[PDB]
Design an enzyme around this catalytic site. Structure first.
Site, PDB file in Angstrom:
ATOM      1  N   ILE A  14       0.524  -1.414   0.167  1.00 47.82           N
ATOM      2  CA  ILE A  14       0.014  -0.437  -0.399  1.00 47.82           C
ATOM      3  C   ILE A  14       0.917   1.537  -0.197  1.00 47.82           C
ATOM      4  O   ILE A  14       0.695   2.426  -0.366  1.00 47.82           O
ATOM      5  CB  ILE A  14      -1.167   0.057   1.179  1.00 47.82           C
ATOM      6  CG1 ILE A  14      -0.528  -0.216   2.543  1.00 47.82           C
ATOM      7  CG2 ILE A  14      -2.321  -1.161   0.445  1.00 47.82           C
ATOM      8  CD1 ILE A  14      -2.154  -0.692   3.215  1.00 47.82           C
ATOM      9  N   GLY A  15       2.081   0.911   0.203  1.00 53.12           N
ATOM     10  CA  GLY A  15       3.476   1.624   0.570  1.00 53.12           C
ATOM     11  C   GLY A  15       3.101   3.705   0.426  1.00 53.12           C
ATOM     12  O   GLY A  15       2.136   3.785   1.314  1.00 53.12           O
ATOM     13  N   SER A  16       4.370   4.202   0.291  1.00 47.97           N
ATOM     14  CA  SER A  16       5.885   3.847  -0.572  1.00 47.97           C
ATOM     15  C   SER A  16       6.348   4.689  -0.518  1.00 47.97           C
ATOM     16  O   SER A  16       5.525   6.207  -1.243  1.00 47.97           O
ATOM     17  CB  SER A  16       5.538   3.294  -1.519  1.00 47.97           C
ATOM     18  OG  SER A  16       6.827   2.872  -2.244  1.00 47.97           O
ATOM     19  N   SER A  18       9.550   6.524   1.283  1.00 46.33           N
ATOM     20  CA  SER A  18      10.374   7.241   1.543  1.00 46.33           C
ATOM     21  C   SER A  18      10.319   7.419   3.420  1.00 46.33           C
ATOM     22  O   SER A  18       8.997   7.500   4.478  1.00 46.33           O
ATOM     23  CB  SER A  18      10.030   9.291   1.698  1.00 46.33           C
ATOM     24  OG  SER A  18       8.760   9.703   2.393  1.00 46.33           O
ATOM     25  N   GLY A  20      10.114   4.615   5.080  1.00 50.90           N
ATOM     26  CA  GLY A  20       8.715   2.884   4.982  1.00 50.90           C
ATOM     27  C   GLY A  20       7.999   2.483   4.380  1.00 50.90           C
ATOM     28  O   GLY A  20       7.477   3.639   4.033  1.00 50.90           O
ATOM     29  N   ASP A 127       4.109  16.827  13.094  1.00 56.02           N
ATOM     30  CA  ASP A 127       3.541  16.275  11.500  1.00 56.02           C
ATOM     31  C   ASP A 127       1.958  16.224  11.474  1.00 56.02           C
ATOM     32  O   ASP A 127       1.847  15.224  11.065  1.00 56.02           O
ATOM     33  CB  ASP A 127       4.918  15.365  11.370  1.00 56.02           C
ATOM     34  CG  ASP A 127       4.409  15.469  10.109  1.00 56.02           C
ATOM     35  OD1 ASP A 127       3.860  16.404   8.965  1.00 56.02           O
ATOM     36  OD2 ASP A 127       5.491  14.013   9.351  1.00 56.02           O
TER      37      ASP A 127
HETATM   38  N1  LIG Z   1      -3.846   1.515   6.726  1.00 53.38           N
HETATM   39  C1  LIG Z   1      -2.596   1.471   7.041  1.00 53.38           C
HETATM   40  N2  LIG Z   1      -2.644   1.239   8.751  1.00 53.38           N
HETATM   41  C2  LIG Z   1      -2.302   1.621   9.275  1.00 53.38           C
HETATM   42  C3  LIG Z   1      -1.429   1.642   9.847  1.00 53.38           C
HETATM   43  C4  LIG Z   1      -1.077   2.239   8.189  1.00 53.38           C
HETATM   44  C5  LIG Z   1       0.226   3.522   7.582  1.00 53.38           C
HETATM   45  C6  LIG Z   1       1.774   2.963   8.346  1.00 53.38           C
HETATM   46  C7  LIG Z   1       2.091   2.017   9.701  1.00 53.38           C
HETATM   47  C8  LIG Z   1       2.803   2.386  10.109  1.00 53.38           C
HETATM   48  C9  LIG Z   1       3.701   1.589  11.454  1.00 53.38           C
HETATM   49  C10 LIG Z   1       3.028   0.486  11.244  1.00 53.38           C
HETATM   50  F1  LIG Z   1       3.344  -0.393  12.402  1.00 53.38           F
HETATM   51  C11 LIG Z   1       2.718  -0.211   9.649  1.00 53.38           C
HETATM   52  C12 LIG Z   1       2.386   1.618   9.295  1.00 53.38           C
HETATM   53  N3  LIG Z   1       2.326   4.366   8.087  1.00 53.38           N
HETATM   54  C13 LIG Z   1       1.370   4.464   7.139  1.00 53.38           C
HETATM   55  N4  LIG Z   1       0.227   4.275   6.427  1.00 53.38           N
HETATM   56  C14 LIG Z   1      -0.630   4.898   5.876  1.00 53.38           C
HETATM   57  C15 LIG Z   1      -1.097   6.355   5.725  1.00 53.38           C
HETATM   58  C16 LIG Z   1      -1.895   6.371   5.277  1.00 53.38           C
HETATM   59  N5  LIG Z   1      -1.348   6.728   3.582  1.00 53.38           N
HETATM   60  C17 LIG Z   1      -1.986   7.127   2.227  1.00 53.38           C
HETATM   61  C18 LIG Z   1      -1.940   8.392   2.055  1.00 53.38           C
HETATM   62  C19 LIG Z   1      -0.393   8.563   1.531  1.00 53.38           C
HETATM   63  C20 LIG Z   1      -0.534  10.214   1.433  1.00 53.38           C
HETATM   64  O1  LIG Z   1      -1.567  10.332   2.344  1.00 53.38           O
HETATM   65  N6  LIG Z   1      -2.297   8.984   2.643  1.00 53.38           N
HETATM   66  C21 LIG Z   1      -1.118   4.373   3.560  1.00 53.38           C
HETATM   67  C22 LIG Z   1      -0.357   4.255   4.613  1.00 53.38           C
HETATM   68  N7  LIG Z   1      -1.711   2.232   6.949  1.00 53.38           N
END
Ligand SMILES: Nc1nccc(-c2c(-c3ccc(F)cc3)ncn2C2CCN(Cc3ccon3)CC2)n1
Length: 292
Positions: A14-16, A18, A20, A127
């Site tokens: 679902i990435g991606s 920078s 991680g 942030d």
């Molecule tokens: N779904 C999900 N459920 C739970 C967490 C996450 C997740 C995490 C994450 C952190 C720690 C961990 F242990 C596992 C995962 N970091 C970022 N995300 C998401 C942030 C939002 N984008 C989409 C987007 C891109 C621009 O604006 N929105 C999608 C990934 N993602």
């Protein structure tokens, strides 16, 4: 076949990517869906191990996702969280980059609460942006979650509650679009700053974009300068023109808070609650994405 921590089946990215990449996952035991953050073990400045401790300190709070697992898998540091729904940036895009006032107010209430909860646990987020707020799944579908403690830092001692000292000449920690004016001035972020950014997020939802977005420059450094200048030349009253007075009252209250001041979160929530009432909106959770 691939099993992170010998338990979470790795699925679609679902990435991606920078700091991680994020992957879909499934717990082999419960059947529960998870999100898996992967971080390269060779990176210049590690963050995953620091972030996991912050998440643990936040456990038990409303709209705080639970960390299921921490590990190392090949040349990656691995973190496992419960799977959450789309972010407010995903939903904003899905709603053609405009939210109705009802949606903005429904979101504002829970967002102020999440920021307040982080502050009660002695941290500032630093942030605050729509990408860092995610909707829950199933029965938690109407719950707003806050994520990403990558730039988070202690603002007061856990035991004494002594606030960190005032300091200037600080680098821009976070996104330029939502950064507070004091962050642009190199001033040490505090509680006020998280809420000021929140006000720009809500105005972004209201407008569709901010007046300092899309500015064309020749370098990254020149672009931040343009945003910084645009944001300082834009008065609260010009930015909020044609929008209810509460968004200006919220922003002016945030900018008028002193460095170590405890914000009146209750007052800020009540501003939008009173407006919600006056607008005659129905008391439900029918957001814009539920009307498409
Ligand atoms: N779904 C999900 N459920 C739970 C967490 C996450 C997740 C995490 C994450 C952190 C720690 C961990 F242990 C596992 C995962 N970091 C970022 N995300 C998401 C942030 C939002 N984008 C989409 C987007 C891109 C621009 O604006 N929105 C999608 C990934 N993602």
């Amino acid at each position: 076949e691939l099993r992170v921590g010998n338990r979470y089946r790795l699925g679609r990215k679902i990435g991606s990517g920078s700091f991680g990449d994020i992957y879909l996952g499934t717990d082999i035991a419960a059947g529960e869906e998870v999100a898996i953050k992967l971080e390269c073990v060779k990176t210049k400045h590690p963050q995953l191990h620091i972030e996991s401790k912050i998440y643990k300190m936040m456990q038990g709070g409303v709209g705080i996702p639970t960390i299921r697992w921490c590990g190392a898998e090949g040349d990656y540091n691995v973190m496992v969280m419960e799977l959450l729904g789309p972010s407010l940036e995903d939903l904003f895009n899905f709603c053609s980059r405009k939210f109705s006032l009802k949606t903005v107010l429904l979101l504002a209430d829970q967002m102020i609460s999440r920021i307040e909860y982080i502050h009660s646990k002695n941290f500032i987020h630093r942030d605050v942006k729509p990408d860092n707020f995610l909707m829950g799944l199933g029965k938690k579908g109407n719950l707003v979650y806050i994520i990403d403690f990558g730039l988070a830092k202690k603002y007061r001692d856990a035991r004494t509650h002594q606030h960190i000292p005032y300091r200037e000449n600080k680098n821009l920690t976070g996104t330029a679009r939502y950064a507070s004016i004091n962050t642009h001035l190199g001033i040490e972020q505090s509680r006020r700053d998280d809420l000021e950014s929140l006000g720009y997020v809500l105005m972004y939802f209201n407008l569709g974009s901010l007046p300092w977005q899309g500015l064309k420059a020749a370098t990254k450094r020149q672009k931040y300068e343009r945003i910084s200048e645009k944001k300082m030349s834009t008065p609260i009253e010009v930015l909020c023109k044609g929008y209810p007075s509460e968004f200006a009252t919220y922003l002016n209250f945030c900018r008028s808070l002193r460095f170590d001041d405890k914000p009146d979160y209750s007052y800020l929530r009540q501003l939008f609650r009173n407006l919600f009432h006056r607008q005659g909106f129905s008391y439900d959770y029918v957001f814009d994405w539920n009307m498409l």
